[PDB]
Design a protein around this ligand. Structure first.
Ligand SMILES: Nc1ncnc2c1ncn2[C@@H]1O[C@H](COP(=O)(O)OP(=O)(O)O)[C@@H](O)[C@H]1O
Ligand SMILES: Nc1ncnc2c1ncn2[C@@H]1O[C@H](COP(=O)(O)OP(=O)(O)O)[C@@H](O)[C@H]1O
Ligand SMILES: Nc1ncnc2c1ncn2[C@@H]1O[C@H](COP(=O)(O)OP(=O)(O)O)[C@@H](O)[C@H]1O
Ligand SMILES: Nc1ncnc2c1ncn2[C@@H]1O[C@H](COP(=O)(O)OP(=O)(O)O)[C@@H](O)[C@H]1O
Lengths: 96, 411, 435, 49, 13, 427, 440, 55
C-alpha cells in the first residue's frame, strides 16, 4: 500500500526482502497524525479558543407526508456511519 | 422597533398603479408618471397572470434613473406573493461552483412554481399526562374545549421521547410523520377541535424539485452545494413527472417571472443560451433592464444596441422609459419624503426639484435624508431651503465632483 | 502599537460643525462635518443601502475620516473594513464575497438563557434497556451550596465518556449545547496519592443546577453560515465539516429567506435588537465591473447596511472593461448612487500640526526647529513621508544620547531615506541600469 | 444555539418524483462497475462457460 | 486475585 | 550539519557598531555604507517594536547587495523574532487568493508568546514497583543531593507503563500533566547485558532539588494560531497551505483575544519582519491590499526589494518608478544601494573566497576584480569556485591567474553569450 | 535489456584525468569545450560544498544540450539524485507554479541513511521462566529471566530475556512450535506464524504456516535507504495509517497540496541535521535538470532568484533553445534565450556548438552502433551528406526505417539504395516547409 | 432484483391493500441511452465500507 513512501509496507518477517530495505530512522520522521496531535497538544490546550458566535442543527430538517421507507434508510445510514468512524473521531475530541 | 427590512431605494413602490383597463394613474401606489412604460408593464403583467404562453421576453430600456428598476419592482409588488418572481443581476451568473449557462437555467427554473395541494391532519393541544412502561404508554391532550386519551404506539412514543420529561407543554403532532413541534409551556392553550384535517397549498419551484431529487439529502437548496444538475436525465424526467402531475389533478404549474437586472452584464455565451432557453414550455416570462446605449457586447468586440446581440433582441419586446419633467420630479420627491419621515417647505421642495432636474434625480432623492438630518441638528422640525443648500455643499454629485478634478491624483 | 491611532473621533461640536483641530483630526472641516451627517444617518437605523464615496488624492485623510466614523459610532455597532481587492476569491463567487460582507455589517444583539448542571458527580448509572442500547444516564451532583440528581441523554453520556469522567470528580454541563467538561478532581482528593496525572480543583459554588441570561450579539452573516455549514454539535455531520469544509455560494432561499424570517421573529417577540452598521469598502477603485454592477442591486435592497466607499484615482479605466474610463475608477452608473465627499489636499500649517499630533502619539519629543523642518520636508515631498521620518529620527536621537529630535537629526534621517518623488529622478537619470 | 434552525417543507409527490416500481428497467444487466471488487477473471472466463 | 508485581531495581550500577 | 554555502552564507549580519555606524568590511558585509546604515536604523526600530506596519523598499541596481542587506538584517535579528522571507511571486496561489496569501505572509511574522512557570519532578529512577489488582504502585527518585518516594495513582501508573520506563532512567514528571520523558540512561541504568538489549545511551543524572519550578514558553505565529483555529482539521499548519481563512470572527477574534492577553499580561506580542523579494512581481490588486494591510496594529514591518525602475506595473499599463504604484510607494521609506567601487569589488571577492575556503594569488585577485568590474559582480563570484575546481584538478595549492583565465574561457557571462548568439537559433 | 531511446548511447562526459576530451570519449563526439565545462560542474556537484549554483546549456536545437546534460547524470552515477524536468511541467491544476519548483528543488537533494538492525527468529521450542530468590516479602514465584529456545535450519539455540519480554511474548499470544521475530534493540516480539513443519496438510487456514527460517537464529545487517527530502516532505504532508479519522481522507485524491515552510523547514530540516551530525545519515545533494527552461513564466524566473540563493538548494542545470525571445508571461519583454536578464546574471553559460560534417558522420555511426544497425561506409557517407543539408537529428533518425527496408529487401546491412529510398519516403522540416510555402 | 420496498402499513390498522393480483407481471418496453448507461457505470453503489463515505 505505501507505494513510494519512505516507510515500508507491512512485512511478514525478515524472511522476505522488504524487511531489510526500510530503516526505522526514516520511519521516525513521518510523524503520523497521532504525534502531530500529541506534540501540538500543549498549544492546542492554550491557543484554540475560536467559536462561531451562533450555532444551528444540521442545514435543515425536511418535513412532508414522506415515503415510508425514506426515514428508516437515513437513520440506518447514520447508524452505519457513526458506528464505524466515531471512535476515529475520538482522537479529535480534544480539539473539538 | 426596527425590523430587518428598512427604508430602501424602492420601498415606496407598493404596486404598478393602473386602472383595470391597464391605464396608468399619473400618481398611484407610489409610482409617478412614466405612463407609456407603466401601461406596457401592465400588459405584460396580465400576460404573466394569464400564463398560457411560455418563454416571453421584455426589455425595459432607458437612461439611468428613469424608473426602469422601479417599474420592475412595481411589477413584482403588483404580482404579489404565490407567483414566483426571481430577481437577479446579470453579474450573478458568473460563478465558481457552476457554469454561467447552468446558473442561467437554474434561474429559469427557480422561476416556475409547481402548486401541489395536500391534506393532512394535525393534533394541537396541551399535554395533561404521559406514560412509559419499559415499550407502551398513553397521552392525554387538552384543548380548552375538550380532553382525550391516546395510545402511544411504538413510533409515536419513540417520537415523543425526543424532548420529553416535561408536561403542560402545548404541542402539535402531525399524524403523517409524528413530527412534534411545541409552542411552549401553557403561551395560551388552543381552542376548538383537538385533531383537525388540514390543507396546505405548497408552491415549490422546479429548481427545488430538481435539487431535492438530485441526491440523498439533496435538499441543500439552502446553501447552493449543488454544482450543476444532471441535465437531460435528472432534469428531463422531472419535466416529464411534472407534466404527469399536471393534466391529472396532482399539481398545477404556476409560471412566474425572471427579472434580470443589468442584463448588459451577460456575455454572448449567456445570450446564446437565452436564445434557446426561452423556447421551451417550461420557460417563464423574463423581463430585463439595461441602461447602456449602443455598446460593445461582453465577450466580443461587436457593438450592439443595449449591449445585447441582435438575434436576441429579435426575441423580445422593448419598452422604453423616458426621463422626467419638473412636475414628475417634484412628485417623486414628494412620495420619497412621504415614504421617509421628513417634511419640507414648499420652497424647499422647489429648490430641491431644480437641484435634481439640474444634476440627476437620484442625487436629489439622496439629499432628502441628509437635509432632514441637518435640520434635526439645529432642532428644527421641517426641512428649509438653507438645509438643502448646506447639504448640497456637503455632498457633491458626480458632475461637480468631476469638475473639482482641477487637481491631480492617481491613475 | 500605533498606525492610524491618533484619530479617535470626528472632532465635531454639539452643533455638528468641525472644530478645526480636535479628537486627533486637524483639517478637512467640510469633509468631517459631512461625515457627521453620515454618522447621524447610521445611528438613526432608518435607512438601508445608502452609500458614501470619500474621494480625493492619496494621503488626504479619506481613511482617517472613515475610521474616525467607526470611532464616532462606538464599538456597539458593526464596522466592517474591507479592501476591494478582497472580492477576488478562489473558493467562492466574486459577487458572493461582496454580498456576504453586506450581511456581516448588520448586527443582531440577542439575549439567551442556557441551563447548567455542575459540581462533583457523586454517582452515575446508565439506564440499561432493550431496543439493546443505553436509554439514559442518571447522575448526582454536589456543590458548596447543595446537592441534586438528574437523568441525562445518551449523547451527554457519550461526551462524558469522550471526557473519561469518574465517580467523585468535578464536571460542568451546558444542556442546551449538550457540551461537557471534566474540570478535574476535587481539592479534597489531593492527598489520595503522592503522584498523579490529575488536576485538583476546589468544589463549584452556587446551585448544582443554575440558569442566567446572556446578551449575545451576532451578525446576519453568522446566522447564515451557522445554517449553511453547521457545527451542529450533536451529530456526525462533522463528516461534512471535514473532507470538504470550503466556502459555499449560500443562496437567497435562506439568506434573504429563512434567516430574515427567523431574525424578524426574534425581533418582534422582544428577544433581539437589530443593529445596522457600516461596510467600509476601502480601495473601491479596483473592484470589477461585475462587482460595480452588482452594487446597483445591493444598494437598492431594503435590508442593506450603510456602505462607505473610499477611492483614490483620477478618471481611469475601470477594471474588467479595458476600454471605458470613468472618474475615481468607478462607473457612472454606481457613481450616480453615492453621495460624494471631497477630501482636501493639506496646506503647510495643517500638515505641520499633523506632524506634531503624530509625534506626540508615539511618545516622541521634537524641538520646534526640527518640527518646522519636518513641515518643510512635508510640503517638499508629502505629508505621510515626513510623518514617517519621526521614528527613525527618534532612534538616532536615542543613539546620540538625546531625549528629543533636533535639526541635524531629521537632516541625517532625511538623507538616509528617500521618498517616492525623490527616487524617480535617480531611476530616470540612469534609466538603462535599473532592470 | 438557535432553535430557529429552519426546516424546509414540501409536498409528498415532490419527494416521490423519481420512483417507479414496474415501469423502470433493470440496470443490473449493464453495471460493469459493480463487478470489479467482487467477480473474478476465472469465474467469468473459465468457470461459468 | 492475581497480584502480579513488576519491579525494576537499581542493583549493583 | 549540511546546509551548503549558498549566495549569502558569508554575511553574518550588518557590520554596524553600537552607534549604528557601518564598518568597511566587518561582519562579512563590504562597502555599501549608506544603505547598510539605513538598514541598521530600521533594524533597531524592528527590535523596539512599538510601531506597526512601517515599510521599507531596498532599491538599486541588480547585484548591489539588496538581498545581501536583507539577509544581513535577518541574521543580525536572530531567532525568537519572526523573519519571514517571501518572493513576490509566491503569493499567486491556486488554492487561495492573492490577498489571503498576503494576509498569511503578514501574520506569519507576528509571534505570540505565552510564558508560564510550572513545577516538575526531575530525577533518576532508583526503583519502580507496580501490582496488578485498579493497579497500584510506588516510584523512588534520586538527584545527586537527595532521594524520595512517591505512591502512584492509577492514571500515573498507566502513563509510566506507557513509556516502559525502569530503574536508571533519568526522567521528568510535569506535575500538571504527568507525561514522562526519559532524557536518557543514568550510569546506573546499565542492563544485565547477559543477552542483547538496548545500547549504552548514557547521560549524567540531575543535580540539586528533586522537585523544581521552571519556565516554559509556548511561541506560535499569528498565522499559526489562526490556522489551528480555522477548522477542526488544523494539522493544515503542516499539511499544506490549504486555507481561505474566514475573515468573519477569526481575524477580529484572534486580534481581540491576543490584545486581551497582551493587556492582562498572559502573552507578549513579538512583531517581526516580512521581507518581500522581487516585490515588482506583485499585482495591482496585491499592492492595493498592502496599502491597508500596512495600516493596522498587528502589522509587522515589511521590507521589499526591486531591481527595476521606470516600467509598467503588473496587471495594468501604468508607468511608475520601481514598478510600484505611487499609492503604496507613499507608505514607504526608500533605501537605494549604490554600485561598488573597484576596492569594494575586490574586497567582496576576498571575503567570498574566504567563505568558500579557496586561496588565490594577488594577481588572481587583480584579474578577477577586473573581470567582475567589466562584466558583473555575481559572475566574478561564480568564477571563484570554478577556478578552484580547475586548480584542484591540476593538484594546485592556490588559484592562479591562468586558472581564472582558463575557466573564464570555459564559461560565459551573458554578454559574450549574446555576442555569440549571432546564429539565429529559435528567435 | 530495454528499448533504445534518443540518448541511450551517451555513457559519460568522456573526460580523462586532466579534464579534457580526446575526441569521442564514452559515446559523445565533439563539443570538447562544452564537455570540459560541465566536466568542471560535475566536480562542483561531487564536492558537495556549494548550494544553488546554476549553469545554462545554451545553443541551437540538436547541438547536444540534453545529451551532455544527462551525460552529467551518467558521470555522477545512480548514487546522487539527478532530477529531470522540462520547462512545461511547472504549469499545473492542483498546485501553484512556484510550489512545483520547490518540490523539484528538494526532490534533487538526497539523504542516504544507514542503520544496522539485528533479529532473532526460529521455531520456538523452549519457553520456560527462571524463578529466583524473593526480592521482597514471601510471595514466591519471582521471575528473574525467561529462557526461550529457537530452531532454524542452521541450529537450535536457547536465549535468556528479561521478564518484560515474557509479558510482551504473552501479549503477542505466541505458542511453543510457532515462528516469532525479536528485534534486539527495540525489544519487540512479532509472531510471524506457526511453523510449516506442523504443516497445513488438511488445515485450510489462511494464517501463514511459515517455513522454518533458513540461516542462523541471529542475523544482523546494515540497511541502507536513500530518500529525497521531498519524500520526507510528502510523507509528512499526507500520511498513512488506519486511525485518526483525518487519515480516512482516503476516498479523496490530493489536490490543494502546496507544502508549508513550517513543516518543510521547521520540522524536517532539524531531523536531517540530527541524523547527519549523529552518524546515521549522509546528505547527497544532487542535480535538478530543467530543459526547455524558456517555457517557465516570469513569475517562475523571479522565484528562481530566491530559490537559487538558498543554502538548501541543489545545483541546477538549465537548458535553453530560443534566441533573443519574448519572456513568457510578459507583455513583449524580449531577452536572450527567452530568460530574463536578471536570472542570466545568476547562471554560468555553457555554449554548445553546431556540428561539422565529420562529427555528424561519427554521431550517425554511434547511433547505428547503438540501435543495432549494420551500415555500409557508402550508406554512412550518404547519411552524412544528406545530414549536412538538414539537421543532424533527421540524418540519425533515417537509420532504423532504412534498416527495415534493408531487412525486407533481404540485406543484412544498409546499402546506399535504402537511405536514398527512405530519404524520399520521409521529409525533414525544411523540405516540408517548402511544400507548405508552395501550396497555398 | 430481490429488492424490498416497504410501501406502508396496511389500511386496516397506512396504504390501501393492493387491489390486483399478488404476482404482478408486465413487459416494460421502455428505452434508455448509451450516456445514461455510462453515467450509471461511472460510480459504485452500496458496499457499507469506506464506500459509505463515497455516498
Ligand atoms: N415612476 C416612478 N415612480 C416612483 N419612483 C421612481 C419612478 N422612477 C424612478 N423612481 C425612483 O427614482 C430612483 C431611480 O431609480 P430607478 O429609476 O430604479 O433607476 P433605473 O431606472 O436606472 O433602474 C429610485 O429611488 C426610484 O425608486
Ligand atoms: N485630518 C487629519 N488629521 C490628522 N491626521 C491625518 C489627517 N489626515 C490624514 N492624517 C494622517 O495622514 C495619513 C494619510 O491619510 P489617509 O487616510 O491614509 O489617506 P488615504 O487613505 O487617501 O491614503 C493617515 O494615515 C493619518 O495618519
Ligand atoms: N555589501 C555586500 N557585502 C558582501 N557581499 C555582497 C555585498 N553586496 C553584494 N554581495 C555579493 O554579491 C552578490 C549579489 O548581491 P545581491 O544582494 O544578490 O544583489 P541584489 O540582490 O541587490 O541583486 C551576492 O551573492 C553577494 O555574495
Ligand atoms: N556530442 C554528441 N555526441 C553524441 N551524440 C550526440 C551529441 N550531440 C547530439 N547527439 C545526438 O543528437 C541528438 C540531438 O542532441 P540533443 O541534446 O537531444 O538536442 P538539444 O541540444 O536540442 O537538446 C541527441 O538526441 C543525440 O542522439
Amino acid at each position: 500500500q505505501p507505494v513510494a513512501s519512505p516507510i515500508g509496507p507491512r512485512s511478514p518477517g525478515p524472511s522476505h526482502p522488504t524487511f531489510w530495505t526500510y530503516t526505522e530512522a526514516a520511519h521516525r520522521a513521518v510523524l503520523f497524525p497521532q504525534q502531530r496531535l500529541d506534540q501540538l497538544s500543549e498549544i492546542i490546550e492554550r491557543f484554540i479558543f475560536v467559536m462561531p458566535p451562533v450555532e444551528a442543527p444540521p442545514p435543515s430538517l425536511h418535513a412532508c407526508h414522506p415515503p415510508p421507507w425514506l426515514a428508516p434508510r437515513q437513520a440506518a445510514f447514520q447508524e452505519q456511519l457513526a458506528s464505524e468512524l466515531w471512535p476515529r473521531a475520538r482522537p479529535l475530541h480534544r480539539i473539538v | 422597533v426596527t425590523r430587518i427590512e428598512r427604508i430602501g431605494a424602492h420601498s415606496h413602490i407598493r404596486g404598478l398603479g393602473l386602472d383595470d383597463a391597464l391605464e396608468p394613474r399619473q400618481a398611484s401606489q407610489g409610482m409617478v408618471g412614466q405612463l407609456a412604460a407603466r401601461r406596457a408593464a401592465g400588459v405584460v403583467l396580465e400576460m404573466i397572470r394569464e400564463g398560457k404562453i411560455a418563454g416571453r421576453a421584455v426589455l425595459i430600456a432607458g437612461q439611468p434613473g428613469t424608473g426602469k428598476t422601479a417599474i420592475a419592482m412595481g411589477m413584482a409588488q403588483a404580482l404579489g406573493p404565490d407567483t414566483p418572481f426571481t430577481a437577479i443581476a446579470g453579474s450573478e451568473i458568473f460563478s465558481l461552483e457552476m457554469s454561467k449557462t447552468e446558473a442561467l437555467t437554474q434561474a429559469f427554473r427557480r422561476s416556475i412554481g409547481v402548486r401541489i395541494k395536500e391534506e393532512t391532519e394535525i393534533i394541537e393541544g396541551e399535554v395533561v399526562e404521559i406514560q412509559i412502561d419499559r415499550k407502551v404508554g398513553k397521552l392525554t391532550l387538552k384543548t380548552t374545549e375538550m380532553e382525550t386519551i391516546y395510545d402511544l404506539g411504538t413510533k409515536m412514543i419513540e417520537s415523543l421521547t425526543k424532548d420529553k420529561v416535561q408536561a403542560g407543554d402545548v404541542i402539535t403532532i402531525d399524524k403523517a410523520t409524528g413530527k412534534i413541534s411545541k409552542l411552549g409551556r401553557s403561551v395560551q392553550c388552543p381552542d376548538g377541535e383537538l385533531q383537525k384535517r388540514k390543507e396546505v397549498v405548497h408552491t415549490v419551484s422546479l429548481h427545488e424539485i430538481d435539487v431535492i431529487n438530485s441526491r440523498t439529502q439533496g435538499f441543500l437548496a439552502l446553501f447552493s452545494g449543488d454544482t450543476g444538475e444532471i441535465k437531460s436525465e435528472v432534469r428531463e424526467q422531472i419535466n416529464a413527472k411534472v407534466a404527469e402531475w399536471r393534466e391529472e389533478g396532482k399539481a398545477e404549474i404556476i409560471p412566474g417571472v425572471l427579472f434580470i437586472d443589468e442584463v448588459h452584464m451577460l456575455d454572448i455565451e449567456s445570450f446564446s443560451f437565452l436564445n434557446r432557453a426561452l423556447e421551451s414550455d417550461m420557460a417563464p416570462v423574463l423581463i430585463m433592464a439595461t441602461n447602456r446605449g449602443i455598446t460593445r457586447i461582453r465577450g466580443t468586440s461587436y457593438q450592439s444596441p443595449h449591449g445585447i446581440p441582435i438575434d436576441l433582441l429579435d426575441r423580445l419586446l422593448i419598452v422604453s422609459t423616458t426621463p422626467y419633467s419638473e412636475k414628475d420630479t417634484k412628485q417623486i420627491l414628494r412620495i420619497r419624503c412621504e415614504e421617509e419621515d421628513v417634511e419640507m417647505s414648499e420652497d424647499a421642495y422647489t429648490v430641491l426639484t431644480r437641484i435634481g432636474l439640474e444634476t440627476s434625480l437620484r442625487y436629489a432623492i439622496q439629499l432628502i435624508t441628509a437635509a432632514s438630518l441637518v435640520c434635526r441638528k439645529r432642532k428644527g422640525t421641517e426641512v428649509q431651503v438653507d438645509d438643502i443648500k448646506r447639504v448640497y455643499s456637503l455632498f457633491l454629485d458626480e458632475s461637480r465632483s468631476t469638475q473639482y478634478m482641477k487637481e491631480y491624483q492617481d491613475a | 502599537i500605533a498606525s492610524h491611532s491618533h484619530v479617535k473621533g470626528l472632532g465635531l461640536d454639539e452643533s455638528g460643525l468641525a472644530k478645526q483641530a480636535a479628537s486627533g483630526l486637524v483639517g478637512q472641516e467640510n469633509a468631517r462635518e459631512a461625515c457627521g451627517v453620515i454618522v447621524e444617518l447610521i445611528k438613526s437605523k432608518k435607512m438601508a443601502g445608502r452609500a458614501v464615496l470619500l474621494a480625493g488624492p492619496p494621503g488626504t485623510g479619506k481613511t482617517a475620516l472613515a475610521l474616525a466614523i467607526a470611532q464616532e459610532l462606538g464599538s456597539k455597532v458593526p464596522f466592517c473594513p474591507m479592501v476591494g481587492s478582497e472580492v477576488y476569491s478562489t473558493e467562492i463567487k466574486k459577487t458572493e464575497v461582496l454580498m456576504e460582507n453586506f450581511r456581516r455589517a448588520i448586527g443582531l444583539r440577542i439575549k439567551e438563557t442556557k441551563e447548567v448542571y455542575e459540581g462533583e458527580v457523586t454517582e452515575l448509572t446508565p439506564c440499561e434497556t432493550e431496543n439493546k442500547t443505553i436509554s439514559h444516564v442518571i447522575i448526582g451532583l454536589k456543590t458548596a451550596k447543595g446537592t441534586k440528581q438528574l437523568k441525562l441523554d445518551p449523547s451527554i453520556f457519550e461526551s462524558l465518556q469522550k471526557e473519561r469522567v469518574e465517580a467523585g470528580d468535578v464536571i460542568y454541563i451546558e444542556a442546551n449545547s449538550g457540551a461537557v467538561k471534566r474540570q478535574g478532581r476535587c481539592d479534597t482528593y489531593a492527598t489520595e496519592f503522592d503522584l498523579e496525572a490529575e488536576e485538583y480543583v476546589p468544589l463549584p459554588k452556587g446551585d448544582v443546577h443554575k440558569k442566567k441570561e446572556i446578551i449575545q450579539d451576532v451578525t446576519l452573516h453568522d446566522l447564515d453560515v451557522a445554517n449553511a455549514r453547521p457545527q451542529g454539535g450533536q451529530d456526525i455531520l462533522s463528516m461534512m465539516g471535514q473532507l470538504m469544509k470550503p466556502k459555499k455560494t449560500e443562496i437567497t432561499d435562506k439568506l434573504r429567506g429563512e434567516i430574515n424570517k427567523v431574525v424578524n421573529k426574534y425581533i418582534d417577540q422582544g428577544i433581539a435588537e437589530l443593529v445596522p452598521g457600516v461596510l467600509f469598502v476601502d480601495e473601491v477603485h479596483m473592484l470589477d465591473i461585475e462587482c460595480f454592477t452588482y452594487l446597483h442591486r445591493a444598494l437598492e435592497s431594503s435590508i442593506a447596511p450603510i456602505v462607505i466607499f473610499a477611492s483614490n484615482r483620477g478618471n481611469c479605466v475601470i477594471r474588467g472593461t479595458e476600454d471605458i474610463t470613468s472618474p475615481h475608477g468607478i462607473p457612472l452608473d454606481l457613481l450616480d448612487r453615492v453621495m460624494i465627499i471631497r477630501t482636501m489636499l493639506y496646506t503647510p500649517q495643517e500638515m505641520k500640526q499633523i506632524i506634531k499630533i503624530r509625534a506626540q502619539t508615539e511618545g516622541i519629543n521634537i524641538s520646534e526647529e526640527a518640527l518646522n523642518h519636518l513641515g518643510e520636508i512635508g510640503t517638499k515631498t508629502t505629508l505621510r513621508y515626513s510623518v514617517q521620518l519621526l521614528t527613525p529620527a527618534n532612534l538616532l536621537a536615542k543613539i546620540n544620547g538625546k531625549d528629543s529630535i533636533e535639526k541635524e537629526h531629521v537632516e541625517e534621517i532625511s538623507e538616509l531615506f528617500y521618498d517616492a518623488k525623490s527616487s524617480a529622478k535617480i531611476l530616470a537619470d540612469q534609466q538603462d541600469k535599473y532592470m | 444555539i438557535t432553535p430557529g434552525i429552519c426546516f424546509s417543507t414540501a409536498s409528498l409527490v415532490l419527494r416521490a418524483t423519481d420512483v417507479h416500481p414496474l415501469q423502470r428497467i433493470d440496470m443490473g444487466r449493464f453495471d460493469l462497475i459493480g463487478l470489479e471488487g467482487r467477480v473474478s477473471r476465472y469465474e467469468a472466463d473459465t468457470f461459468l462457460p | 486475585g492475581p497480584i502480579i508485581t513488576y519491579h525494576s531495581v537499581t542493583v549493583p550500577r
